[PDB]
């Protein structure tokens, strides 16, 4: 499962361990212990009571392409594993997030939204040109990259269990989160739902704290 | 894969996500990047330099049956997920770890090792008899169980990534750890080796800190 | 601050870093930023919205004496630091939790609550006698202790931040938790309230999930 | 204690809990247990054997001003607490890290190091000018800031225990880490040494893995 996000981003599921029954088993190993009706009720019971440790036995790995300002927010989720493309080690690609003019809907601006779009493209092009000039002059990559803007795309692998994923969705699939990461959270939710439908529906009904899903 | 440990214990692998190539990929997503020779060298490189985050993308779930004193030590490993049979909720089974007389090899004792074995069996039988008397009298399980000894068997599910597993092996597959948990660690190592042979061999060669493997 | 718990237990505050203003500062370093009215409102704002990271900058260390079955439950809180008296290394003291007859109020039993109390004392005395016999015969401590019951007292140091402490109180200062750990949680709450009154009151009003405080 | 880093950065100690004796106590609560000679030997013993949990009972809070590319690397240390100035919420200040010409010593470049310095200043000035134009036109701050470069200064509070701090120093006070974060790590080390001299010296002698301290 792969989902395009923003203008050049994506979220892709690379691997998964377990399913809804993984949580039911782990939880049962407590009672020294059925059928779809009872196992689904147990999932709802756990979710209703905040007994979320059993969901840690469901694990996902995603490959994500996102702008640096989005990745900065995402990487604040400490209960997870990350490995990210390095600007110290690699030549960084010319790929930037340019907001669509619709991104400014609701805001009165004193320059046209299409001109905001152009101004962002222009500065990012100038910054990349400076970056490449520095690189081609023999400046180390790790220094050259410091002129690149926060809308540069980066890529990372993310391994996260279902409990920590539900925390991420509470926080990022929510109107208070920046719109850009919301869009990534909606994609993560769609994949979670596909892989763990009983857990996801129980999450939405009983535990999900956000206002978008 | 299932392995008998001690007199009545076991370690069983329930599920696994990923393999040696999972770490190679995750690490490559850094260099914006081969073949078995190069991928194996990368694993050794990571291990040699303590660059262990890529191994967090390999995850295991085990089902473990072990005495409570072993589980107490094991559950000190915080970077992992656990769910354990409950004495508050369930009637606990009559199953205790009784050391073999060989457990005392090296120790001069003033009672015969076979008599130590009998004395342990006798007290555990008396404790269980009291437990069952309390339960059958209407004492709540969560109170009745407090008379049961630390050699009572318990069971748990353990979900752990390969980096945290390597930490566990450093500490528990080692002569300083109690012999009983060492035996469980040897089983965990055998399963890790089977599932992740390049990572395991690189671990032993370059990073493993213990003295048994 | 020290508080007696159960028959022989205690909770003592050893050290603390920070106060209510530590969370206000840390949070302000977000807005590049007052007075008691505004700082108290900010605390309530954070608590109301689940924005709890600023409370991680308040840290406590406690010294706790508790029975092993209580410590087993407590040590499940992974987002904290522990060091505990060892039965491998030390001769363990004759100190056991014996429930009061009032512990069984609400339960119809077919033996008198005072006789349950005596039966627990009797088995614990027999177990300790076996332990000491094994120790005095030259059995290693780490093996001898396996006959000791779960109501043996142990001691530990616990270092925990205020966010993780609030999680502990949600779970353990609650009717669903075993009564014995509830009593320890009530003591932890009393100390937290004394040290962080604005945070504590905001916690109770807006975020606390339990039913006892 | 406050230390200037780079051209406009700093590291300041805001608060601390505990000292070398905090680790000695916590560790002793294991043996159910002296003087400066014995307590210092215990610290060395723990460090020599990797028995580092007792050092988690020493905790620091720092206030750090650093460029975003440095903060991105720093915030990868998950076993710690962070709160950072927000570009969604605040107008960001015109403050950028401009490397000194000495930063390029060892590198043959085909433009003079002083001209690299000027090219970096020029692009950062243009990016900030665009940022301010967007802000003053009514573009939301959270969108306007995406044009700002990675050498923008940010500020954060960091609360970290001594074990996690030692991990940070292993990784960041080391020639493999980017020079800029090395400079911050050297400052963190100087403060750690001042506050915990026995732990620090034992760390350097027995456990420190880097090549700078
Ligand atoms: C709308 C919004 C605005 C934000 N604004 C800012 C801002 O201005 N500045 C800023 O710095 N950050 C900001 N954040 C980031 C925020 O403070 C969190 O870092 C982020 O939401 C991750 O949440 P988390 O800690 O629950 O997740 P994780 O770090 O994944 O932790 C998951 C859970 O584990 C626990 N946990 C993990 N580590 C610890 C620990 N050390 N102590 C206690 N419990 C722990 C907690 O229960 C936590 O919920 C903002 C986030 C949101 C959604
Ligand atoms: C021979 C031996 C004797 C022992 N004796 C005692 C004893 O007498 N008393 C006792 O209480 N315990 C004892 N232990 C337990 C020991 O203190 C550790 O709790 C256990 O070994 C788990 O190690 P860990 O913290 O590295 O693992 P985990 O808790 O799984 O942590 C893994 C890694 O994550 C990091 N980490 C996780 N949480 C934190 C945190 N909060 N702060 C900083 N870093 C963190 C560290 O890098 C750590 O190595 C003993 C263990 C051994 C092997
Ligand atoms: C009434 C009651 C009955 C219980 N019954 C049982 C039982 O029968 N069997 C049993 O084994 N346990 C049982 N528990 C223990 C329970 O499953 C938890 O281990 C314990 O409550 C600690 O909760 P916690 O994980 O939130 O705390 P911590 O481990 O301190 O974690 C704090 C927060 O950090 C986050 N976190 C930390 N580590 C991870 C991780 N690896 N993945 C995702 N998020 C993480 C979560 O947000 C978590 O809330 C019971 C607890 C209660 C209160
Ligand atoms: C020279 C250098 C180059 C780097 N290059 C890259 C790169 O190219 N791309 C990139 O993404 N990152 C890179 N990093 C970052 C690196 O991968 C680590 O994220 C960073 O060094 C923090 O290390 P840590 O995980 O030990 O620290 P923390 O996250 O603070 O963890 C401390 C300890 O807790 C344990 N721990 C915590 N969480 C877990 C977990 N979930 N599972 C298992 N154990 C855990 C481990 O024992 C760990 O050592 C680089 C770092 C260095 C120093
Ligand atoms: N906070 C908290 N955490 C918990 C639990 C809890 O009650 N509270 N418990 C719920 N538990 C189960 C297990 C099996 C069944 C069932 O068979 N009926 C029902 C519940 C397991 C355990 C998991 N962790
Ligand atoms: N502490 C520390 N952590 C790290 C690293 C590091 O150097 N030090 N890095 C090693 N990295 C790679 C990635 C690809 C190749 C390769 O293709 N040759 C080689 C190394 C990835 C990254 C992972 N984390
Ligand atoms: N999930 C989540 N986490 C968060 C926040 C958040 O909004 N949501 N933020 C709330 N923030 C502040 C800082 C200062 C003020 C004030 O001066 N008025 C108000 C709020 C800081 C930040 C901390 N972490
Ligand atoms: N991995 C590992 N972790 C450990 C220990 C250990 O041995 N290995 N232990 C070392 N311990 C002490 C306590 C007191 C003294 C002393 O009085 N002589 C000596 C050692 C405490 C405990 C802490 N954690
Ligand atoms: O919605 C937010 C706002 C902030 N942050 C974290 C990420 C950065 O570490 C820091 C500043 O982020 P920005 O506000 O500049 O995006 O706070 C988030 O995680 N999410
Ligand atoms: O080898 C050891 C010794 C101790 N402990 C931890 C587990 C308990 O929380 C506490 C006391 O354990 P025992 O020494 O009693 O096994 O310290 C271990 O994890 N491993
Ligand atoms: O209320 C509870 C019940 C269980 N457990 C955890 C602790 C043990 O690891 C395991 C079994 O505990 P008991 O039910 O036997 O107390 O589950 C708790 O933390 N709290
Ligand atoms: O020395 C390094 C190199 C990388 N990273 C982490 C931080 C970012 O999340 C990602 C890319 O960092 P840069 O290589 O671009 O600095 O990897 C570090 O923490 N330290
Ligand atoms: Cl390109
Ligand atoms: Cl039985
Ligand atoms: Cl005694
Ligand atoms: Cl300014």
Listing DSSP states for B86-129 in one string gives -TTTSPPPS-B----GGGGTT---SS-HHHHHHHHHHHHHHHHH
Is B32:A57 a contact under the CB 8 Å cutoff?
no
Distance CA A95, CA B75 (A): 45
D55-65 as b/e: b if 16+ CB within 10 A: bbbbbbbbbbb
Neighbours of A48 (CB within 10 A): 12
Q: How many CB pairs under 8 A join B and D?
A: 6
Distance CA D131, CA D128 (A): 5
Phi, psi of A152 (to 5 degrees): -55, 135
Is D188:D165 a contact under the CB 8 Å cutoff?
yes
CA-based nearest residue to D175, from D165, D183, D166, D187: D183
Is D160:C59 a contact under the CB 8 Å cutoff?
no
Check whether domain D1-213 has CATH 3.30.1490.20, yes or no: no
Chain C residues whose CB is inside 8 A of the D61 CB are: 17-18, 22, 26, 57
- Give me the torsion for CA of A134, A139, A142, A146, rounded to 10°: -40
End-to-end Cα, chain C, rounded Å? 19
CB within 8 Å: B150 and C151: no
Distance CA B39, CA D158 (A): 37
The shortest C-alpha distance from B156 to chain C (Å) reads 13
Please tell me which of the candidates B49, B50, B209 has its beta carbon nearest to residue D50: B209
The shortest C-alpha distance from C39 to chain B (Å) reads 35
C172 flagged as catalytic: yes
Q: Domain extents for chain D?
A: 1-213
For the beta sheet containing C153-161, the strands, ordered from the edge strand earlier in sequence to the opposite edge, are: C2-5, C9-17, C59-67, C153-161, C81-84
CA-based nearest residue to D57, from D199, D190, D210: D199
Chain C residues whose CB is inside 8 A of the D16 CB are: 17
Angle, helices D113-137/A113-137, rounded to nearest 10 degrees: 170
Chain A residues whose CB is inside 8 A of the C170 CB are: 50
Distance CA A110, CA B85 (A): 64
- How far does residue D50's CA lie from ligand 8's centre (Å)? 9
Residue C198 CB-density burial (10 A; 0-12 exposed, 13-18 middle, 19+ buried): buried
Beta bridge partner(s), residue B66: B154
- How far does residue B93's CA lie from ligand 14's centre (Å)? 4
Angle, helices A197-206/A179-195, rounded to nearest 10 degrees: 130
Look at the alpha carbons of D117, D118, D121, D122 in this order and tell me if their dihedral is positive or negative.
negative
Please tell me which of the candidates A111, A137, A148 has its beta carbon nearest to residue D150: A148
CA C49, C26, A142 angle in degrees (round to 5)? 105
- Kindly report the length of chain D: 213
Distance CA D184, CA D71 (A): 10
- How far, in Å, are A96, A153, A182, C112, D52 from residue A8 at the CA level? 8, 8, 16, 74, 45
Residue C34 CB-density burial (10 A; 0-12 exposed, 13-18 middle, 19+ buried): exposed
Long-range contacts of B32-36 (CB under 8 A, 24+ apart): B32/A85, B32/A90, B32/A91, B32/A93
End-to-end Cα, chain B, rounded Å? 19
Distance CA C17, CA B4 (A): 47
- How far does residue D182's CA lie from ligand 13's centre (Å)? 29
Residue A212 CB-density burial (10 A; 0-12 exposed, 13-18 middle, 19+ buried): middle
SS (H, E, C) C50-115: CCCHHHHHCEEEEEEEEEHHHHHHHCCCCCCEEEECCCCCCCCCCCECCCCHHHHCCCCCCCCHHH
Is C162:C60 a contact under the CB 8 Å cutoff?
yes
The SS3 assignment for D5 reads strand
> Which residue of chain A comes nearest to B25, CA vs CA?
A157
User: Helices in chain A by DSSP H: which ranges?
Assistant: 20-28, 36-48, 68-74, 113-137, 141-144, 162-172, 179-195, 197-206
Is A17:A195 a contact under the CB 8 Å cutoff?
no
Give the residues after which the backbone of chain C is interrupted, taking a C-to-next-N distance over 2.5 angstroms as a break. Answer: 29, 33
Per the structure block, which two tokens stand in for D71?
């903060």
Distance CA A165, CA A159 (A): 10
Q: Whose CA is nearest to atom 15 of ligand 9?
A: D87
Helix (H) / strand (E) containing B207 = none
Neighbours of A, requiring at least 3 CB pairs below 8 Å, are: B, C, D
Among the bound ligands, the one closest to the CA of C83: 2
Chain C residues whose CB is inside 8 A of the D91 CB are: 32
CB within 8 Å: C209 and A50: yes
Instruction: Give residues with Cβ within 8 angstroms of C86, minimum separation 6.
Output: D30, D31
Ligand 6 close to Cβ of residue B30 (< 6 A) = yes
Phi-psi region of A6 (alpha: psi -120 to 50; beta: other; left: phi over 0): left
Q: Whose CA is nearest to atom 17 of ligand 1?
A: C53
The SS3 assignment for B52 reads coil
Helix (H) / strand (E) containing A17 = strand A9-17
CA C163, C166, C170 angle in degrees (round to 5)? 145
Residue B131 CB-density burial (10 A; 0-12 exposed, 13-18 middle, 19+ buried): buried
CA-based nearest residue to C123, from B120, B87, B143, B129: B129
Per the structure block, which two tokens stand in for D79?
């076993």
Ligand 4 close to Cβ of residue D167 (< 6 A) = yes
CA D101, D103, D108 angle in degrees (round to 5)? 80
Distance CA C61, CA C57 (A): 13
Distance CA B100, CA A5 (A): 61
Is D165:D81 a contact under the CB 8 Å cutoff?
no
CB within 8 Å: B49 and D176: yes
> Distance between alpha carbon A173 and the CA centroid of its chain, in Å?
10
Distance CA C130, CA B122 (A): 10
Distance CA C176, CA C169 (A): 12
Distance CA D19, CA D21 (A): 5
Q: How many CA atoms lie within 13 A of B125 on its CB side?
A: 7
Q: How many CA atoms lie within 13 A of A40 on its CB side?
A: 8
The response to whether B167 counts as a known ligand-binding position is yes
DSSP classification of residue B147: G
Is C29:D156 a contact under the CB 8 Å cutoff?
yes
Per the structure block, which two tokens stand in for B185?
């660690």
Phi, psi of B91 (to 5 degrees): -75, 125
End-to-end Cα, chain D, rounded Å? 19
The SS3 assignment for C8 reads coil
């Amino acid at each position: 499962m792969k989902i395009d996000i923003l203008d050049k981003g994506f979220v892709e599921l690379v691997d998964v361990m377990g399913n809804d029954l993984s949580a039911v088993r782990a939880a049962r190993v407590s009672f020294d212990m059925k059928d779809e009706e009872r196992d689904r009720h147990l999932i709802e019971y756990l979710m209703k009571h905040g007994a979320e440790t059993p969901f840690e036995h469901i694990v996902f790995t995603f490959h994500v392409k996102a702008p640096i300002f989005v990745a900065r927010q995402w990487f604040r989720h400490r209960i997870a594993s990350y490995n990210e493309l390095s600007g110290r080690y690699s030549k960084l690609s010319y790929e930037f997030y340019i907001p669509s003019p619709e991104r400014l809907e609701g805001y009165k601006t004193t320059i046209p939204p299409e001109r905001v779009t152009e101004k962002i493209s222009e500065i990012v092009d100038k910054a990349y040109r400076t970056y490449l000039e520095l690189i081609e002059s023999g400046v180390p990559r790790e220094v050259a990259r410091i002129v690149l803007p926060l809308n540069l795309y980066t890529r990372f692998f993310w391994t996260v269990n279902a409990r920590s994923l539900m925390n991420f969705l509470n926080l990022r699939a929510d109107s208070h989160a920046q719109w850009e990461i919301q869009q990534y959270a909606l994609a993560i939710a769609r994949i979670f739902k596909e892989k763990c439908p009983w857990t996801f529906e129980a999450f939405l009904k009983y535990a999900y704290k956000g206002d978008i899903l």
